[PDB]
Amino acid sequence: HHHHHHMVHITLDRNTANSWLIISKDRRQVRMGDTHQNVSDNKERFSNYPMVLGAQRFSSGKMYWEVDVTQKEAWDLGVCRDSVQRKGQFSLSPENGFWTIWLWQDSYEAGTSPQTTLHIQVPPCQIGIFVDYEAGVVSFYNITDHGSLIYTFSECVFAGPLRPFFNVGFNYSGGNAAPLKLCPL
């Protein structure tokens, strides 16, 4: 792909984070803590899952960023509406304001409803995410495999400002402690 020149500097918004997440000083990394991280509750925090938003809001233009997923067993990545539900249980789909892919139980899927199987020969260590607001497109790229296309959501109906979306996943197995990291431009 040739989307690299739309690179944007994403930082994580602490206030949206589930209370067990640990966000680094530079706001560029996030991991699952082994306990509540001693923060006060607020209406922005994702309560039920290990999720956090980027601070940046996008309402026009073309945007690109990269995320490191090295050695993780489970995670979700993409974008979401600024007004997605924070509390309780919910489906990760465009109907609920999410445009995402994930890894779970050794397979990759796109968060359509129902979910779509992805075809990945080279497990990615870094994922590229491209958003074209005007076109209604969200695309995902395998940086480990020379930028090959993973998935394109087209005909997107964003219906609001978009925020970068992250889920570090649970660590029930003891094999999913590694962080998500925003990769340098």
Ligand SMILES: CC(C)N(C)c1ncnc2c1cnn2C
């Ligand atoms: C098969 C569906 C319902 N599950 C379990 C999931 N869907 C999307 N992201 C997920 C999971 C599990 N972990 N993460 C990060």
Ligand SMILES: CC(C)N(C)c1ncnc2c1cnn2C
């Ligand atoms: C929001 C949902 C899709 N997420 C991230 C989930 N994560 C982990 N386990 C899950 C789910 C859903 N069901 N189950 C059993």
